[PDB]
Symmetry: D2
Subunit: 237 residues, 4 copies
């Protein structure tokens, strides 16, 4: 079983799994049932931006999603990740469609992570930035229906030639290099991630959403994790 920590933009309220009554941001720790959520007003066909922040001092995971018109939603959860994740992890983006559907299109993604040790600095750090994705992007590991290069963007879930989103689709993109997320001997571990995205739906009720996630290095898409499970978890426990 993979170990997953994620921030979800959940466009589809499955109330059966503890989802709220409306599209939402949520913080998911080893469960599809968010530890915390906040109401999110999703704008169809508009380009949004998500920022994720964490530091080992405050031990608080925070996320915000905003649109150029000023609408934004934030969620924060107090958690000590030293106690959750493995020392080494990979980070990525995941997206799905269900019975209902949407394009899950990533326009850009950047990430920064830092470890300052008991050695008093001698800091290790990683930063990457993608503002365009080519057809062969060798520094990304693509899983599922994810493709790169279409209009210089990353399409996480299946889209036809004419731009129409497909249902029952799942895809993920992980950064090629492993990340050293924490160390018992680290005095501070902190990271932030940013991505811009475009969700569009022709039909009623888009679903199911997009998530930024951190997993064990060897993580792969759990079976039947399409739709409401967001390509992250094998079940709703």
């Amino acid at each position: 079983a993979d170990t997953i920590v994620a921030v979800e933009l959940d466009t589809y309220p499955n109330t059966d799994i503890g989802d709220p009554s409306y599209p939402h941001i949520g913080i998911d720790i080893k469960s599809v049932r968010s530890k915390k959520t906040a109401k999110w007003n999703m704008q169809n066909g508009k380009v949004g931006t998500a920022h994720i922040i964490y530091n080992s001092v405050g031990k608080r995971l925070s996320a915000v999603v905003s649109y150029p018109n000023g609408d934004s939603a934030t969620v924060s959860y107090d958690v000590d990740l030293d106690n959750v994740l493995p020392e080494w992890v990979r980070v990525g983006l995941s997206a799905t469609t269900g019975l209902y559907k949407e394009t899950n299109t990533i326009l850009s993604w950047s990430f920064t992570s830092k470890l300052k040790s008991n050695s008093t600095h001698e800091t290790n750090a990683l930063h990457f930035m993608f503002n365009q994705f080519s057809k062969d992007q060798k520094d990304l590991i693509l899983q599922g229906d994810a493709t790169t290069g279409r209009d210089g963007n990353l399409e996480l879930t299946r889209v036809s030639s004419n731009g129409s989103p497909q249902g029952s689709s799942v895809g993920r993109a992980l950064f090629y290099a492993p990340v050293h997320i924490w160390e018992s001997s680290a005095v501070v571990a902190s990271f932030d991630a940013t991505f811009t995205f475009l969700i569009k739906s022709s039909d009623s009720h888009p679903a199911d959403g997009i998530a930024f996630f951190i997993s064990n290095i060897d993580s792969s898409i759990p079976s039947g994790s399409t739709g409401r499970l967001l390509g992250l978890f094998p079940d709703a426990n």
Copy 2:
């Protein structure tokens, strides 16, 4: 009256002002009376490192001080700085000595601040790093007894030719450029700061401490702010 927000390494417990019974880290908002403190075991003559982190999402100010031997102390306080500081500020370091004394020596200082707007990025950012200070460091504004260039370090308070710390001393160093700390239209404002320091005392009970601070751009040392007031505040209110 200046507006001050600071993180204090308070080596001297003035219990009269609400200081704890022991040297401590503290978070000070417009008052010398910390909103929150944590016990700190100060190691005389050892080089320490302080990290300060804040983000507008979690709205939590965090600080940690550590030594190479693994000892560290952390403190966090939930605060919305949009409601405290002016839109534009300056950042700096301050240090003092009282009746008792210590060297306040800064070995290195770095800082990073970012504003992502309602414009959806078009981000503004500032970063600077000093790992050595020359005799004339033009990008620093020195106030009080602060000097640069001695052994490539920044000495915040008065030290004689032979290295002996002087009492009743106060000094500050501010970065030359103003910083845009928040904007009503900003979706995220975040910053972090790091500095390494060396506190040494020949006599009993070093005092009074060192602080990292953010103030209105025109801030200058309040009169009689030496000793326990840390060159920050005009009084103990």
Copy 3:
């Protein structure tokens, strides 16, 4: 007399001062007479981007200007800046108009500079980024006709209410903090700068151009340095 090193985007050929027979990029060292130039096809009304790069190892100053359509021009010149500039400098943008005119609009500007010493690192560095300029941008020093905040941009030369460029105009913007550009004891000093710009003209030939420059810290606009002198030099020597 100021000491000026600049990269010019010269939209107007003043053959009398050694300018080429067409708009051009040029490298100017202590003279309006470029040490090296390259032909530049300026696109009226289009948004361009300039990048400038230098390092103390190769001791080569390089610049490129490009447009989204793929047109670009580059120029490089071998030079040891240790022998030209003062140890401490300021960096800025300058623009002018003359008998002929153009808007000199800066959309964004970023800069990074680093000094790695004989101390083996203990590196000092500065980075800033502006992707929007507000009406009161405290970390910029504005000289001449330069204004900030109009459509979130920086307008270096005078523009009327209705958007019409004015003739015989000059303006500069300098970053507020001084920059430590070289040190006798530095093993490497390197910097890069980037800005995006929009030049528009209603009338016949636009003039006179925009430059990125580095000067002594107290540099101010030389008298009569409008038009072909680009606000940088007091004469054409």
Copy 4:
């Protein structure tokens, strides 16, 4: 056959392969026979620092090696890498010993690479920094005799339990993620790399040296490339 571009710190002059009559820095393009070299006074047992810089504008590859005592050597070579390397590459460190020997210890290594496209920015970038290496450093690919974790350092070539260097040894470390080094449509591609190293020898002349290199993504150590071939090239052509 791999495609290799490297900067060599050649501690052993093999005059038979065009090496100079003294230890030297060199720039090697697809050949062990440096295109350019500079005399290098290697200090046995001292910690050195190497910096490497390149940009697509100046199209000049530069390198400097320095020690804390102020001794340094630099070498530069004009080259258009667009015409040499594949679009995607990996970067790494290599070292060898031969008949003669030395420790090839890396203390720290950082790297930054950036591509600004014809799209006008939408920049892609990668940065990493190692200031300590643990026993299991998952973001490094180790080849040959290379090991990590001994005193928090990276030992590229074989060293016994007691610290004694072994002869006829070769080892390399490559960053785990591929790097997009150029693109036909990029307006600027630039990178820099820095590492600190410790070379020690008990016996008479140390050999054979350490190199920073860029290769095709699937590059592996060519057979018999120990000693003077530095683990990079299959022959001396």
